[PDB]
Scaffold this active site. Structure first.
Site, PDB file in Angstrom:
ATOM      1  N   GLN A 181       0.881  -1.177   0.000  1.00 43.29           N
ATOM      2  CA  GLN A 181       0.000   0.000   0.000  1.00 43.29           C
ATOM      3  C   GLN A 181       0.922   1.232   0.000  1.00 43.29           C
ATOM      4  O   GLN A 181       0.546   2.333  -0.445  1.00 43.29           O
ATOM      5  CB  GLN A 181      -0.757   0.129   1.321  1.00 43.29           C
ATOM      6  CG  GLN A 181      -1.997  -0.606   1.550  1.00 43.29           C
ATOM      7  CD  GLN A 181      -2.415  -0.469   3.036  1.00 43.29           C
ATOM      8  OE1 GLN A 181      -2.774  -1.449   3.675  1.00 43.29           O
ATOM      9  NE2 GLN A 181      -2.325   0.746   3.585  1.00 43.29           N
ATOM     10  N   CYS A 229      -5.951   0.605   2.323  1.00 43.12           N
ATOM     11  CA  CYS A 229      -6.247  -0.826   2.579  1.00 43.12           C
ATOM     12  C   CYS A 229      -7.592  -1.284   2.071  1.00 43.12           C
ATOM     13  O   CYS A 229      -7.750  -2.403   1.658  1.00 43.12           O
ATOM     14  CB  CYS A 229      -6.110  -1.201   4.048  1.00 43.12           C
ATOM     15  SG  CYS A 229      -7.006  -0.214   5.203  1.00 43.12           S
ATOM     16  N   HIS A 232      -8.414  -1.560   9.747  1.00 43.47           N
ATOM     17  CA  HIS A 232      -7.688  -2.044   8.576  1.00 43.47           C
ATOM     18  C   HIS A 232      -8.486  -3.131   7.847  1.00 43.47           C
ATOM     19  O   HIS A 232      -9.158  -3.918   8.452  1.00 43.47           O
ATOM     20  CB  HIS A 232      -6.321  -2.544   9.109  1.00 43.47           C
ATOM     21  CG  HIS A 232      -5.324  -2.915   8.064  1.00 43.47           C
ATOM     22  ND1 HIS A 232      -4.955  -2.072   7.046  1.00 43.47           N
ATOM     23  CD2 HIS A 232      -4.628  -4.061   7.878  1.00 43.47           C
ATOM     24  CE1 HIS A 232      -4.088  -2.684   6.267  1.00 43.47           C
ATOM     25  NE2 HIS A 232      -3.875  -3.892   6.751  1.00 43.47           N
ATOM     26  N   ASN A 244      -2.471  -9.701   3.849  1.00 39.22           N
ATOM     27  CA  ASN A 244      -2.245  -8.302   4.247  1.00 39.22           C
ATOM     28  C   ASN A 244      -1.533  -7.612   3.102  1.00 39.22           C
ATOM     29  O   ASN A 244      -0.960  -8.263   2.239  1.00 39.22           O
ATOM     30  CB  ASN A 244      -1.406  -8.210   5.547  1.00 39.22           C
ATOM     31  CG  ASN A 244      -1.478  -6.836   6.220  1.00 39.22           C
ATOM     32  OD1 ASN A 244      -2.244  -5.963   5.832  1.00 39.22           O
ATOM     33  ND2 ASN A 244      -0.718  -6.669   7.247  1.00 39.22           N
TER      34      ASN A 244
END
Length: 216
Positions: free
Chosen positions: A19, A25, A159, A179
């Site tokens: 990111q 996110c 998140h 992630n």
């Protein structure tokens, strides 16, 4: 449905991304769930553009947070383009969707998992990758580099990540999550968070807001 799932093994997950220094996110997780359902429906695994959502989702705030539902709704309405055609820049620019090449992968709906409930979440993961929320603020989530995360996180989610599988290893159930902090975090960019625990908001509040793109 089964005792275990892993969409990466079924070839429905692309490489772990960065990111960078931008609060996107929400855009990252929604692209991962869409690349996932496209390969599932279509058999084709292609990388899609988080950048388009960053510039184009007008309900969200580009590099300053955004929504799971509104980005999922953007793809349902307008489709989304290839990552290579609309490159990530870690900054919010002017929407290039029409200039880039008008609609490429398109979905037709968006579903939200019944909240605070292990069972429903597994049933949704069992069908495809889901966009989940987690509290990432903590130092333990932050410096996590491996294993089944029992925690030291509260439930103040902040998140959006992508639940790509679940299983049991050593007595414990877990949710396998992709992630977007690059491969240098956790298990090669991935985290296995412990599942359920008597409290239904889930570990690190992972049962709070779960969405998935619906492709008819």
């Amino acid at each position: 449905l089964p005792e275990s799932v892993d969409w990466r093994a079924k070839g429905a997950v692309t490489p772990v991304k960065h990111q960078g220094y931008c609060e996107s996110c929400w855009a990252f997780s929604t692209v991962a769930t869409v690349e996932g359902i496209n390969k599932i429906k279509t058999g084709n695994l292609v990388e899609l553009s988080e950048q388009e959502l960053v510039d184009c989702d007008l309900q969200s705030y580009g590099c300053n947070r955004g929504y799971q539902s509104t980005s999922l709704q953007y793809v349902a309405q307008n489709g989304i383009h290839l990552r290579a055609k609309y490159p990530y820049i870690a900054k919010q620019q002017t929407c290039r969707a029409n200039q880039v090449g008008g609609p490429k992968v398109k979905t037709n709906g968006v579903g939200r998992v019944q909240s605070n409930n292990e069972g429903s979440l597994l049933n949704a993961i069992a069908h495809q990758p889901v966009s989940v929320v987690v509290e990432s603020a903590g130092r333990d989530f932050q410096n996590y580099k491996g294993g089944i995360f029992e925690g030291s996180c509260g439930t103040k989610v902040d998140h959006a990540v992508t639940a790509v599988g679940y299983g049991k290893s050593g007595g414990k159930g877990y949710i396998l999550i992709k992630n977007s902090w690059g491969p240098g975090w956790g298990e090669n960019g991935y985290i296995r968070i412990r599942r359920a625990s008597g409290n239904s908001p889930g570990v690190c509040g992972v049962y709070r807001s779960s969405y998935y793109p619906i492709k008819n």
